[PDB]
């Protein structure tokens, strides 16, 4: 399984997003929380508040689950990073198999 | 060293059992956080508050942490995910190390 | 690209610390956020609040950057903790090797 990192602008556009990645069974599950991003929005350092999304998946759905979220997402280069797990309990990854595509 | 990632349904179990892993000298530290948490729960798409947990141990303790922690956990099916840490500061790896069984 | 974690005792660090970071072109981008921290101070069990911090920079700057934050860490043994990214969309990736050193 993979777990894959994306950030989203706000709340409303973070639960949009992935509510319709569970429609379209491209991922088991997600955990959103806020927190305070710092980058350079080319040119200065800027600070805002935003929505960070962790999913859980399977490891072969991650170029459709990447090309899924490049189409929804509002951001025109948003963020979608892949992290590989190196194991997982069992039932688990049984059950994020049995929920997803 | 290694990272290891669960989810509980609330604060009182999240605490409760990572004040047991750190008492039996299973991880190093343990992050808790709340997120809201989206899946299917064999059905339809649910929506609750949860509290995410990471855990920081060692790479040898995985199978023995994976299996407490389904012994305590109180959900039946857990998420009990391993993330390996590529590298880290020898220090912190020393104090980790000391800590653990 | 990597992944760098790193905890910080308070925002005031945190911020301090990772505008420095920003500013010095060690990192594209820090993700923060708060999470209640449980570990042994060598002794006991301590709780506390903490904030996490979520590096996001290029691989070959990792070094570096491990050197820089143990300079300006409040810690004297912080957590500096590298994931590798195993995969990410290619126009993310433009941007944070043209925002980063």
């Given at each position: 399984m993979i777990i894959v990192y994306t950030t989203f602008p706000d709340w409303e556009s973070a639960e949009k997003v992935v509510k319709t990645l569970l429609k379209e069974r491209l991922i088991a599950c997600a955990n959103l929380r806020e927190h305070r991003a710092?980058?350079?929005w080319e040119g200065k350092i800027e600070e805002d508040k935003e929505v960070g999304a962790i999913?859980?998946?399977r490891?072969?759905?991650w170029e459709?689950?990447?090309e899924r979220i490049?189409?929804?997402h509002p951001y025109d280069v948003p963020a979608?990073?892949?992290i590989d797990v190196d194991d997982v309990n069992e039932?688990?990854?049984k059950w994020l198999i049995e929920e997803t595509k």
């Open positions: 710092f980058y350079w999913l859980k998946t490891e072969d759905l459709e689950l990447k490049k189409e929804l979608i990073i892949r039932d688990y990854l």
